[PDB]
Each structure stands twice: as structure tokens, then as C-alpha cells.
From a paper:
For all paramyxoviruses, the nucleoprotein (N) encapsidates viral RNA, leading to a N-RNA complex which, together with the RNA-dependent RNA polymerase (L) and the phosphoprotein (P), forms the viral replication complex. The P protein is thought to be responsible for the recruitment of the large polymerase L onto the viral N-RNA template through direct interactions with N and L. In addition, P chaperones the nascent N, which is sequestered in the form of an RNA-free NP complex. For all members of the Paramyxoviridae family, the P protein is an intrinsically disordered polypeptide which forms tetramers through a central α-helical coiled-coil region. The analysis predicts the presence of a central, highly conserved region with α-helical propensity located between residues 158 to 237, which we refer to as Pced.
A single diffracting crystal of HMPV Pced grew after 140 days, suggesting degradation occurred in the drop prior to crystallization. Diffraction data were phased by molecular replacement using residues 169 to 194 from Pcore, revealing a tetrameric α-helical arrangement consistent with the modeled structure. The asymmetric unit contains 2 tetramers, with a solvent content of 40%. Since the asymmetric unit could not physically contain 2 tetramers with residues 158-237 (with 1 tetramer present the solvent content is 16%), packing considerations suggest that degradation necessarily occurred prior to crystallization. The residues 158-168 and 195-237 are absent from the structure, in line with the flexibility observed for these regions by MDS and SAXS-based ensemble optimization. Additional stability is provided by a solvent-exposed network of ionic interactions created by Glu173/Glu177 and Arg175, or Glu180 and Lys182 side chains from neighbouring protomers. Comparison with representative models from the SAXS optimized ensembles, as well as with the best scoring models from MDS demonstrates Cα RMSDs ranging from 0.9 to 1.6 Å over aligned residues, confirming the accuracy of the modeled Pcore. The structural data presented here indicates that the α-helical tetramerization domain of HMPV P (residues 171-194) is considerably shorter than the highly conserved central region of the molecule (residues 158-237). Interestingly, the sequence of Pcore aligns with a region of RSV P that is necessary for coimmunoprecipitation of the L protein, suggesting either direct binding to L or the requirement of a tetrameric P protein for efficient P-L association. The short tetrameric coiled coil from HMPV P clusters in a separate branch from SeV/MuV/MeV and RV/VSV, emphasizing the pertinence of its classification as a separate subfamily, Pneumovirinae.
Numbering used by the authors:
A (entry chain G): 168 to 193
B (entry chain F), C (entry chain E): 170 to 194
D (entry chain H): 171 to 193
The structure:
Amino acid sequence: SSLSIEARLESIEEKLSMILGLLRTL
Amino acid sequence: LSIEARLESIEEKLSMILGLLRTLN
Amino acid sequence: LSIEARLESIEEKLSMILGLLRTLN
Amino acid sequence: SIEARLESIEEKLSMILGLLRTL
């Protein structure tokens, strides 16, 4: 926390992309 | 690179994950 | 339309994913 | 509450991540 909304959101999005990449291998 | 643009993309990803998960064997 | 509206929707999707992920185990 | 929403979202993500590893 204390990283701002813009930077905090970047990570959420990059974490979701990882999950999608991993899921698409099934 | 906009809060609105970033959020839309996030929403898309979540729905995609849900769609992929519903089909999970 | 509106950050708060999307954020609520995003939160709802995350909860759904959690339930499913817990269900798969 | 926005700053509060993000914290809640961030916490759901952690569980999801952990659960993926449990797969």
C-alpha cells in the first residue's frame, strides 16, 4: 500500500494476466 | 494508461478467467 | 461508466472466482 | 471509499493466487 491507485492497479492487472496465461494451458 | 482504460481491461480479464474456470475439468 | 461502478463489478467477479477456486479443490 | 476498495480487491487476489498453487 501507499503506492497510488494508478501503480496499484498496474499490478492487479499484471497478476490477472499471469492467471489467464496459466489457465489457457488447460 | 487511463484509470478508466486500465479498469476496463481488468474487468475483461476477470470475465475471461470466469469463462475459462466454468469450463474447468 | 464511473470508476466506482466498475470497481463494484470487479469486486463481484473476484468473489465469484474465489468461490469457484475453493470449489475446484 | 476507493482506497478501501483496492485493499479489498488486493486481498481477494492473494487468496486466488494461493488457491491456483493448491491446484
